[PDB]
Amino acid sequence: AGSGQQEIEQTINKYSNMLTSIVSSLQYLEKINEVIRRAWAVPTHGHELGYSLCNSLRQSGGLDLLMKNCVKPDLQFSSAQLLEQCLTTENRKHVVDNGLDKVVNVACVCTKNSNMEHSRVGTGILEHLFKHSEGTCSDVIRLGGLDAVLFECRTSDLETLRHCASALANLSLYGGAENQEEMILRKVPMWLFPLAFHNDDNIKYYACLAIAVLVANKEIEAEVLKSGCLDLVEPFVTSHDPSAFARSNLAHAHGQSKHWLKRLVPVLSSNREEARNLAAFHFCMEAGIKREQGNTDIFREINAIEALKNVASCPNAIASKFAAQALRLIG
Numbered sequence: 001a002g003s004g005q006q007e008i009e010q011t012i013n014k015y016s017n018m019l020t021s022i023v024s025s026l027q028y029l030e031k032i033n034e035v036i037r038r039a040w041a042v043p044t045h046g047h048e049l050g051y052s053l054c055n056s057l058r059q060s061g062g063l064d065l066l067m068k069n070c071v072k073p074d075l076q077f078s079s080a081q082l083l084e085q086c087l088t089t090e091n092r093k094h095v096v097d098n099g100l101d102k103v104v105n106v107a108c109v110c111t112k113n114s115n116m117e118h119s120r121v122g123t124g125i126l127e128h129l130f131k132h133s134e135g136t137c138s139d140v141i142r143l144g145g146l147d148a149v150l151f152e153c154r155t156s157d158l159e160t161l162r163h164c165a166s167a168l169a170n171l172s173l174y175g176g177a178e179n180q181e182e183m184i185l186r187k188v189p190m191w192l193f194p195l196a197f198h199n200d201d202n203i204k205y206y207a208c209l210a211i212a213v214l215v216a217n218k219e220i221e222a223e224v225l226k227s228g229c230l231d232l233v234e235p236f237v238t239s240h241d242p243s244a245f246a247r248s249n250l251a252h253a254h255g256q257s258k259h260w261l262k263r264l265v266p267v268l269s270s271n272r273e274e275a276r277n278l279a280a281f282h283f284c285m286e287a288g289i290k291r292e293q294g295n296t297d298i299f300r301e302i303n304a305i306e307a308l309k310n311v312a313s314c315p316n317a318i319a320s321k322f323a324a325q326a327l328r329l330i331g
């Protein structure tokens with residue numbers, strides 16, 4: 001099964017072949033979800049094993065099978081559970097292109113029911129589906145995903161609240177102007193406020209991050225400033241260790257994507273001090289991660305360097321130290 005930090009690709013190959021053989025059973029045996037759930041858990045190599053196994057899932061035709069039998073009741077949750085853990089970038093594209101409606105609807109009905117594992121699965125699927133495009137975000141809003149996450153914002157489960165915060169951040173980033181207007185109409189800040197004041201640092205971080213991304217839009221700045229949650233940014237960045245907060249979150253995974261960070265870049269140039277503080281904090285985190293993985297040139301491909309320098313120059317010392325440390329971790 002799963003052991004430790006070694007140089008073994010034989011396990012990648014073994015469990016990929018197991019997965020493809022089980023998937024070939026087309027005309028229950030959803031231990032594929034257990035194997036992938038524990039594959040992502042591998043201490044350091046979990047990213048590689050997970051990506052290779054999800055690619056094996058798509059290539060063996062299993063992704064199409066999941067999207068097909070997710071409108072069948074007896075195989076609904078059993079399949080959606082596995083789909084929440086294999087919504088990689090390529091799989092995300094495949095789903096968005098050849099069956100968004102079914103996946104969105106199964107996530108909605110997973111959140112509608114009282115069983116907590118189902119709600120976790122549904123909120124996670126929605127989170128991952130909000131990381132594609134303005135068009136995809138608009139469509140998911142139309143199909144009722146935003147309503148589901150804003151309803152789950154009232155929950156107690158921690159996994160669900162984390163999925164909800166990450167989903168609202170992803171939507172603030174990938175939505176655009178129209179979708180951010182829609183978010184303000186749905187009173188997104190109202191239900192983000194209960195999350196920003198959470199004790200769990202992940203929920204607070206990503207809720208505040210969605211709020212910061214939202215104040216950057218100069219049309220909704222006031223309504224997002226009525227929340228109150230940006231006044232919780234300065235104590236957080238000044239009391240949290242950028243390297244250690246990375247190790248707890250988004251370090252097992254190789255940080256956020258270059259496109260996620262590209263959406264975040266324009267936050268570095270906002271009117272609000274707290275927005276720039278939090279964006280700088282996040283970039284100082286991602287810079288160290290990317291340096292560990294040798295993908296630092298990303299920050300130049302997204303024209304983040306100009307904004308990082310402009311921020312490292314500005315008077316505000318909270319963001320100046322973070323942006324400067326980020327620039328040194330790149331070159």
Ligand SMILES: O=C(O)c1ccc[n+]([C@@H]2O[C@H](COP(=O)([O-])O)[C@@H](O)[C@H]2O)c1
Pocket residue numbers: 040046047050083084085086087088089128252253254
């Ligand atoms: O990136 C990782 O190391 C990782 C760790 C645990 C789970 N995953 C799953 O891999 C998929 C892609 O993750 P992400 O962050 O690119 O949206 C998604 O289904 C995640 O739930 C990914």
